[PDB]
Design an enzyme around this catalytic site. Structure first.
Site, PDB file in Angstrom:
ATOM      1  N   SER A  36       0.809  -1.213   0.000  1.00 53.92           N
ATOM      2  CA  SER A  36       0.000   0.000   0.000  1.00 53.92           C
ATOM      3  C   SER A  36       0.854   1.280   0.000  1.00 53.92           C
ATOM      4  CB  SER A  36      -0.973  -0.082   1.153  1.00 53.92           C
ATOM      5  OG  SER A  36      -2.076   0.810   0.949  1.00 53.92           O
ATOM      6  N   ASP A  65     -10.035  -3.817  -5.260  1.00 49.74           N
ATOM      7  CA  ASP A  65      -9.211  -2.833  -4.594  1.00 49.74           C
ATOM      8  C   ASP A  65      -9.279  -1.573  -5.452  1.00 49.74           C
ATOM      9  OD1 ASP A  65      -7.167  -1.293  -3.495  1.00 49.74           O
ATOM     10  OD2 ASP A  65      -5.636  -2.954  -3.508  1.00 49.74           O
ATOM     11  N   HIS A 121      -7.959  -5.100  -0.898  1.00 52.16           N
ATOM     12  CA  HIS A 121      -6.803  -4.382  -0.381  1.00 52.16           C
ATOM     13  C   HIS A 121      -6.462  -4.910   1.013  1.00 52.16           C
ATOM     14  CE1 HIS A 121      -4.030  -1.033  -0.638  1.00 52.16           C
ATOM     15  NE2 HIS A 121      -4.200  -0.853   0.657  1.00 52.16           N
TER      16      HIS A 121
HETATM   17  C1  LIG Z   1      -2.398   1.210   3.288  1.00 50.84           C
HETATM   18  C2  LIG Z   1      -3.181   2.231   2.538  1.00 50.84           C
HETATM   19  C3  LIG Z   1      -2.338   3.158   1.676  1.00 50.84           C
HETATM   20  C4  LIG Z   1      -3.121   4.258   1.020  1.00 50.84           C
HETATM   21  O1  LIG Z   1      -4.307   4.283   0.817  1.00 50.84           O
HETATM   22  O2  LIG Z   1      -2.275   5.294   0.648  1.00 50.84           O
HETATM   23  C5  LIG Z   1      -2.771   6.376  -0.114  1.00 50.84           C
HETATM   24  C6  LIG Z   1      -2.588   7.692   0.293  1.00 50.84           C
HETATM   25  C7  LIG Z   1      -3.076   8.738  -0.478  1.00 50.84           C
HETATM   26  C8  LIG Z   1      -3.740   8.453  -1.658  1.00 50.84           C
HETATM   27  N1  LIG Z   1      -4.291   9.553  -2.484  1.00 50.84           N
HETATM   28  O3  LIG Z   1      -4.130  10.715  -2.098  1.00 50.84           O
HETATM   29  O4  LIG Z   1      -4.914   9.262  -3.506  1.00 50.84           O
HETATM   30  C9  LIG Z   1      -3.926   7.151  -2.079  1.00 50.84           C
HETATM   31  C10 LIG Z   1      -3.438   6.113  -1.301  1.00 50.84           C
END
Ligand SMILES: CCCC(=O)Oc1ccc([N+](=O)[O-])cc1
Ligand SMILES: CCCC(=O)Oc1ccc([N+](=O)[O-])cc1
Length: 298
Positions: free
Chosen positions: A148, A242, A272
């Protein structure tokens, strides 16, 4: 393809200060570990001096060393949650199943630290590990890995490696976040109800990034980088259901077309986070994929 049966049950039985939400995330991980205990594994805590301060690490030592590069692992949790303990279940299994030394990294969390501090820290730890590797009887080229947000960090570290004089033998991306700019079909279609949600991702970005403009920065959105030639061999694991699926698979396709040795595996019916959820047999199947991929590296 239908939701995995156990995943469907998990989603069906699912029901705050920053500190409380962090504690809650940690209680959730402990719960899963009680349900399916991790394998015993020798570990040593330590601290790496980085350009942004001390960074706690935990080194995992396999019962039998069979892989010739250290792994450096960066936990997920949206840059806000998680630590070495929340990801112990995954790292202990990576260590023992692959037969590799693994460095699990407790990088600085947002919003207290903001982009790009964790990137810098993660680069510095990778460099430390490369330097130490000969003393562990290993090759200096490292393997970076993460789930992630941690997959984001692994991807970015991999893109920066040549410029930072960092020898990297491979990158292992577990359902990574890679593009904070573009909507994909998966991000639209699986935005609610599959554990990782749209509104959560927005919130994580608000905590991590300095301003909305940071989304276009390649150290936040590595999928934006136009030149992927010469990047380290990649294993990219995705979950079918996901929101981050599509950006992960697209990045794998771009790596492949840039001549990077790439293995792309989608776990059907999965969500996810599945590689830190040992209630799903697919977690161990994915760890087996890692071992089989790393067998091919030399
Ligand atoms: C473990 C989850 C990781 C996660 O969702 O990180 C992210 C942080 C920011 C964004 N975004 O701004 O789109 C996406 C995923
Ligand atoms: C996923 C996009 C998140 C985003 O735009 O992050 C931020 C929004 C506003 C600020 N700010 O102005 O403080 C910082 C980050």
């Amino acid at each position: 393809m239908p939701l995995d049966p156990r995943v469907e049950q998990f989603l069906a039985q699912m029901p705050l200060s920053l500190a409380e939400a962090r504690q809650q995330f940690k209680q959730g991980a402990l719960l899963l570990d009680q349900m399916v205990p991790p394998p015993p594994v020798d570990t040593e805590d330590g601290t790496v001096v980085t350009t942004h301060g001390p960074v706690r690490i935990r080194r995992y030592i396999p019962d039998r060393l069979r892989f010739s590069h250290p792994l450096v692992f960066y936990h997920g949790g949206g840059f806000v949650f998680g630590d070495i303990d929340t990801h112990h279940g995954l790292v202990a299994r990576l260590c023992q199943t692959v037969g590799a030394t693994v460095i699990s990294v407790d990088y600085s969390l947002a919003p207290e630290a903001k982009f790009p501090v964790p990137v810098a820290e993660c680069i510095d730890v990778a460099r430390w590990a490369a330097h130490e590797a000969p003393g562990w009887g290993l090759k200096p080229s490292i393997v970076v890995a993460g789930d992630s947000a941690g997959g984001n960090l692994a991807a970015v570290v991999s893109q920066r490696a040549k410029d930072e004089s960092l020898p990297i033998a491979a990158q292992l991306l577990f359902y990574p976040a890679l593009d904070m700019v573009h909507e994909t079909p998966s991000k639209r279609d699986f935005a609610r109800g599959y554990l990782l949600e749209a509104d959560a991702m927005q919130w994580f970005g608000e905590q991590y990034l300095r301003t909305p403009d940071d989304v276009s920065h390649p150290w936040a959105s590595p999928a934006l980088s136009p030149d992927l030639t010469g990047l380290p061999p990649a294993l990219v694991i995705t979950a079918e259901y996901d929101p981050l699926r599509d950006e992960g698979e697209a990045y794998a396709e771009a790596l492949r077309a840039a001549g990077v040795p790439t293995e792309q595996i989608r776990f059907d019916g999965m969500i996810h986070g599945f590689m830190t959820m040992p209630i799903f047999p697919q977690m161990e199947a994915a760890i087996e994929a890692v071992a089989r991929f790393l067998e091919r590296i030399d």
